[PDB]
Paper text:
By contrast, the integral membrane protein EzrA was identified as an inhibitor of FtsZ polymerization and its absence results in the inappropriate formation of multiple FtsZ rings, not only at mid-cell but also at the cell poles. EzrA comprises a single, N-terminal trans-membrane (TM) spanning helix followed by an ~60-kDa cytoplasmic domain15, which sequence analysis suggests forms an α-helical coiled-coil. The BsEzrA22–562 and the shorter SaEzrA24–214 rods comprise multiple copies of the same ~100 amino acid, triple helical bundle; BsEzrA22–562 contains five such repeats and SaEzrA24–214 contains just two. Although many proteins are known to comprise bundles of antiparallel α-helices, EzrA is, to the best of our knowledge, the only bacterial protein that is formed from serial spectrin-like repeats.
The crystal structure of B. subtilis EzrA lacking the N-terminal 21 residue TM helix (that is, BsEzrA22–562) was solved by selenomethionine single wavelength anomalous dispersion (SAD) to a resolution of 3.95 Å. However, through the use of highly redundant data, the experimentally phased electron density maps of BsEzrA22–562 enabled the building of 96% of the 540 amino acids in the structure. The only regions that could not be built were six residues at the N-terminus and a loop between Ser177 and Asn190, which the sequence predicted to be disordered. Overall, the BsEzrA22–562 monomer is a curved rod, forming a complete semicircle with a diameter of 120 Å. Groups of three α-helices pack together along its length, except at the C-terminus where there is a four-helix bundle. The formation of a semicircle confers the potential of the C-terminal four-helix bundle to interact with the membrane at the same time that the N-terminus of EzrA is embedded in it through its N-terminal TM helix; this can be modelled trivially by manually extending the N-terminal α-helix of repeat 1. An anti-parallel dimer is observed in the BsEzrA22–562 crystal lattice as a result of crystallographic symmetry. The dimerization of BsEzrA22–562 in the crystal buries some 3,300 Å2 of surface area (~9% of the total) in an extensive, molecule-long interface. The principal axes of adjacent repeats in BsEzrA22–562 intersect with angles of 37, 38, 33 and 53°, resulting in the pronounced overall bend. However, EzrA is the first spectrin-like repeat-containing structure in which there is a pronounced enough bend between a sufficient number of repeats to form a complete semicircle.
Numbering used by the authors: 24 to 176, 191 to 559
Amino acid sequence: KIYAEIDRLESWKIEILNRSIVEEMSKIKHLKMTGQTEEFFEKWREEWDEIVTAHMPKVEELLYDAEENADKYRFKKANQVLVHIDDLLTAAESSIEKILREISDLVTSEEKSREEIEQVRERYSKSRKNLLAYSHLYGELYDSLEKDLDEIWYITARKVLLEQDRNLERLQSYIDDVPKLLADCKQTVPGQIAKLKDGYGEMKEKGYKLEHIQLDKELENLSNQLKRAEHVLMTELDIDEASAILQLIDENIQSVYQQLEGEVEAGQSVLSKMPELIIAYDKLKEEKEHTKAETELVKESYRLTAGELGKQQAFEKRLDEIGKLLSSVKDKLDAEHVAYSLLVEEVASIEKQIEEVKKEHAEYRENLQALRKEELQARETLSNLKKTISETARLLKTSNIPGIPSHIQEMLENAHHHIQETVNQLNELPLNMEEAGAHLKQAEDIVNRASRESEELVEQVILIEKIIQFGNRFRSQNHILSEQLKEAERRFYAFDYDDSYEIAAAAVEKAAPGAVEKIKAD
């Protein structure tokens, strides 16, 4: 039922709003009028309102709801129709209102922009007034520009203005940058070409044919880039690409400069790598070390033996080799054609070649000097081994059973048979430390590993003696077992007495391995 009221509402609304806006066509915003674009809408506004004076009385006709007051089903079927119609009209109205609130906008706005546009064309006449470099295209541009501005004198005109903005932007985007642009194709293009060719002209005191291929070619690339830049600018193309080309060129140039400074470096490095050949004679003191190698005649004659007199001569071989590499390097260097830079890789090796050999001859200096000390610590070791052997030899008393019956005439017949070797050592004149060291590796762990076992045997004998010394003859089955130990020990067997005192631990307290072993450890 209330739908009827809503129907009145969206009728009063549309009618009053349309009355107002149609009333607001001649009595408002009437200022400005183009006799072309306006006469289009001066008909569109008519027919658009001619619609609503036909499509609203259709709604008036369709007020059958007044009669259809008996049903509620046929109601909405002839109601939503109408409401959607009203929506269809008022959606076609606000479209118009937006149309006009643009035409009145797209005039009054652009009417305030032509001021700035003319203001800019006043500052482009001036900026080309005083100019003759590159002022052939500028004339054409200014000309067409002012032709356009002369043409603008509605919406089409707005568009033309909006064109002229961008056009102006391009005009001073030109007039600003182009000054410096040509200014490099006159004093900064040959300004660098001259500096580089005269560069080579100077670098004719430090340059080779090896670089007569990858050197003079980059100028053949540059001399292209320049003409490419020119063909860019002088043709309708603009700062874009060309301003990049200048960068590319600059990169090329300074790359070349770096390449030159690197050979200045290679030239300067030699002056610190060929006074290293001054030390190449300071290490030619072979005949000063081979005189130090004439104290073989007085002592340590193993210098004259292998693995010692050798190696040094091999370092004389190495010194000959590097000595030849030097002459080859200088020979290659001192040519009628100038020197260059590929030499650096050929000397970095040589610095190492001396760095090593020097340390080698140093090592052999040390080796020679050490021998005089080697036959001292050796004398210490032997003079000690004698003491050890003595004391253990005397320790081999008191133990009523002759120790290691098999290993007695074995590890003691190495006491005499590895001292007569030392007789041969410190009696030799000149002696040799190899003959000494050999009969010392054969002296180590053959004196000790014969004293350890012996001391363990003495310990064992004293122990067992003090064990049976607590032999308890008062027992009947322990005594007769104890007798089976004496008869076993007085032979020549080291296990015969092992299970011996194990019996003496299986009839005596748990502290049997501590009964005697403690008293002994006192």
